[PDB]
Amino acid sequence: ASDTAVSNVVNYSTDVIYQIVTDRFVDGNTSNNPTGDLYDPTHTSLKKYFGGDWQGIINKINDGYLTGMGVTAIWIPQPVENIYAVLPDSTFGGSTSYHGYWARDFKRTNPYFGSFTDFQNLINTAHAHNIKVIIDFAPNHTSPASETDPTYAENGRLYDNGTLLGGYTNDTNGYFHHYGGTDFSSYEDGIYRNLFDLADLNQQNSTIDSYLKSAIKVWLDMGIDGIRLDAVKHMPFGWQKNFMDSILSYRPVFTFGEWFLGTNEIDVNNTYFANESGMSLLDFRFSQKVRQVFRDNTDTMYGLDSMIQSTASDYNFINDMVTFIDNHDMDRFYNGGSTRPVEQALAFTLTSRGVPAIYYGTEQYMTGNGDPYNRAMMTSFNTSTTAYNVIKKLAPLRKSNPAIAYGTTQQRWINNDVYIYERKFGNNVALVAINRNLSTSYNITGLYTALPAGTYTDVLGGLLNGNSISVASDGSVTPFTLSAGEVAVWQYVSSSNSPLIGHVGPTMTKAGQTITIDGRGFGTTSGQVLFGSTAGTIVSWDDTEVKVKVPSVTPGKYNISLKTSSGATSNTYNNINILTGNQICVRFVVNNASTVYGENVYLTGNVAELGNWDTSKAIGPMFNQVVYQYPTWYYDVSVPAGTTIQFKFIKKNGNTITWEGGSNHTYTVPSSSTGTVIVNWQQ
């Protein structure tokens, strides 16, 4: 199977995701609809169940609507059993779990969406049509709760395949956090306190850790192809790395988290998370900039290029960034007036780096500013809209042109309103020109490209007013006019390729596991895959995909390269993280660690998971507000099971790092359960 096959579920760079709000798409089976106050058959009371279900999605796969658009993946809300209570809402009358965000049993289905058999039907129907299926999973919380009023909602009660674990009131087991609600005043505050009134799960509780691992395996066993993890800024990094290892050790699938970033927001924790957690991220830097430039007129094409360059610098796995122009929370991109801006934002996203996702109804110009106005029932299945056809024409290019799926991005021409950029992967090229100005044309002179000499037709066929270009042997493009609102796409796909790696997944692995290397020019005869300079055992070999067993190298990060059977060597794909063993979440706690202003406590130790004594990569800054208070510090850390570790704490700020004196602390990590290790700072 090639890199582009539906069964390659660790690489989504060749795909286009269609994000469906299940309840609000198609009611394919009325018999599974809720009854009473939960359900609104009129589809107008925007926090009720409207009846959209998995059979409905199946219908639109079978009838060609989604495939006719070039959709190759769907992303659906959490499939798990949700609460049945109808909650008061002064604006919408009643408020329900239609959205899937309010889990009561992570091991069972939401019966309104369907049974496990319906879910199976969805997976199988999608696969029969070369569509991958991503599910939301929201292990941060169960549902709205009041500890003092257990009659409110379902008191956040959690079940384990029908068996009650417990609720938020009288939580004698400590399944939930009891630290009030977050005001988002710090990263720490947002992790250990409740989001709104949602009962915050305590993942450090060994029963809950084991439960959530068991629960995601239920869905992996149902044949899901990907996971979108909700609220990843609101759970410990260490717990989530541990959670990711459980998934990837069982059956690896592409996983991406939601870590919201606002306009112009800078957060090094977001970069770290994407680079270290073992999962990818929804690309808010991309999305917010696209909105600024194409929708809201608060930045220019210069800002768009700056985002392209900055994100590529910061993120180790730029091809895994999940891009989008709107979603279930943002104001819908189409806001009235000309539809050209949304068409342009779609074209940009579909031809840019990463993994594009399109929110249902974007192709029908649906409007709606704010949750839940942005979640109206799907309005139309008209296949003649300009937006539908932009997607139809551009989506398949991610499969047919490896420059689009995997290539670098280079600015070739720019002014405030015009961006001409080039995607390049070996001798494969895509050149895209966009003029956002809806009233002014631009004369394009001095343009150069890596496209071979020749004349190139617009892949869009003039749908967005594109036209042909002529390219000379020196790469110079004959002057041309970019008309108002024009988008044009020109491409060259080479008939041959030197070995080129476009993607490796998963990025967090260990000895004996299998990783997938995708690209071009590997040849059909088996060669060699190198982890640094150490060969791995070949599982399978094809021109666009090699599967290889991870060798027993010293745990840490490795740069992957490939050598063909003739001896040709590929580029390196960097920073594949080889763990020491299966992961466990351990809470590290240090008492009596006093610091000066601007100084924080960090953890360092003698395994890769603790940075192998590298103070510049020490774990932290540690926390000291919620679970324990300064000068006690704590942090939840993913560490190798059953391993006897040595560690110390350090204090750093910018002047001179202070280490604990004395001998190293030592601790043997549990074999399967979460653990806590508490020590006193050593002078």
Catalytically active residues, by annotation? 230, 258
Is 27 or 486 the residue whose CB approaches Ca ion more closely?
Answer: 27
Please enumerate in sequence order all residues whose Cβ is within 8 A of that of 64, keeping only pairs 6 or more positions apart, or say none: none
Query: According to the binding rule CB under 5 A, does residue 561 interact with Ca ion?
Result: no
Is 259 or 492 the residue whose CB approaches Ca ion more closely?
Answer: 259
Number of residues that bind Ca ion (CB under 5 A): 9
Backbone φ and ψ of 534, nearest 5°: -105, 120
Is 201 or 447 the residue whose CB approaches Ca ion more closely?
Answer: 201
Window of 116-124, 231-239, 516-524, 610-618 that interacts with Ca ion by CB under 5 A: 231-239
Q: How far is the CB of 416 from Ca ion (least distance, A)?
A: 42
Query: According to the binding rule CB under 5 A, does residue 299 interact with Ca ion?
Result: no
Q: How far is the CB of 194 from Ca ion (least distance, A)?
A: 8
Rounded CA separation 431/470 (Å): 12
Is 287 or 674 the residue whose CB approaches Ca ion more closely?
Answer: 674
Whether residue 320 is annotated as binding a ligand: the answer is: no
Query: According to the binding rule CB under 5 A, does residue 51 interact with Ca ion?
Result: yes
CA distances from residue 662 to 619, 646, 678 in whole angstroms, order as listed: 20, 12, 16
DSSP per residue over 164-227, as a string? EEE-STT-TT--B--S-B---SSHHHHHHSBSTTEEEB-TTSHHHHHHHHHHHHHHHHTT--EE
Whether residue 196 is annotated as binding a ligand: the answer is: yes
Percent of the chain that is helix, strand, coil (3-state, to 5): 20, 30, 50
Whether residue 645 is annotated as binding a ligand: the answer is: no
Window of 100-108, 139-147, 180-188, 425-433 that interacts with Ca ion by CB under 5 A: 139-147
Rounded CA separation 70/395 (Å): 5
Is 106 or 531 the residue whose CB approaches Ca ion more closely?
Answer: 106
Window of 20-28, 152-160, 351-359, 367-375 that interacts with Ca ion by CB under 5 A: 20-28
Is 27 or 518 the residue whose CB approaches Ca ion more closely?
Answer: 27
Whether residue 11 is annotated as binding a ligand: the answer is: no
Window of 58-66, 134-142, 461-469, 533-541 that interacts with Ca ion by CB under 5 A: 134-142
Rounded CA separation 91/284 (Å): 29
Rounded CA separation 118/57 (Å): 11
Check residue 427 and report its DSSP letter: T
Q: How far is the CB of 281 from Ca ion (least distance, A)?
A: 18
Query: According to the binding rule CB under 5 A, does residue 234 interact with Ca ion?
Result: yes
Q: What angle do CA 132, 285, 506 make, to 5 degrees?
A: 40
Backbone φ and ψ of 604, nearest 5°: -135, 155
Binding string, residues 645-674; x marks residues near Ca ion by CB under 5 A: ------------------------------
Rounded CA separation 487/625 (Å): 52
Rounded CA separation 489/388 (Å): 17
Q: What angle do CA 176, 181, 183 make, to 5 degrees?
A: 140
Number of H helices, E strands in the chain: 12, 40
Rounded CA separation 450/471 (Å): 9
Query: According to the binding rule CB under 5 A, does residue 147 interact with Ca ion?
Result: no
Rounded CA separation 123/121 (Å): 6
Chosen residue from 53, 81, 609, 636 binding Ca ion by CB under 5 A: 53
Q: How far is the CB of 252 from Ca ion (least distance, A)?
A: 25
Is 156 or 407 the residue whose CB approaches Ca ion more closely?
Answer: 156
Chosen residue from 3, 23, 27, 305 binding Ca ion by CB under 5 A: 27
Chosen residue from 32, 125, 205, 497 binding Ca ion by CB under 5 A: 32
How far does CA 588 lie from the centroid of its chain? 28
Q: How far is the CB of 88 from Ca ion (least distance, A)?
A: 25
Binding string, residues 182-211; x marks residues near Ca ion by CB under 5 A: ------------------x-----------
Residues contributing to the site for Ca ion (CB under 5 A): 27, 29, 32-33, 51, 53, 140, 200, 234
Provide the annotated binding site for Ca(2+): 27, 29, 32-33, 51, 53, 140, 191, 200, 234
Provide the annotated binding site for substrate: 101-102, 141, 194-197, 228, 233-234, 328, 371, 375
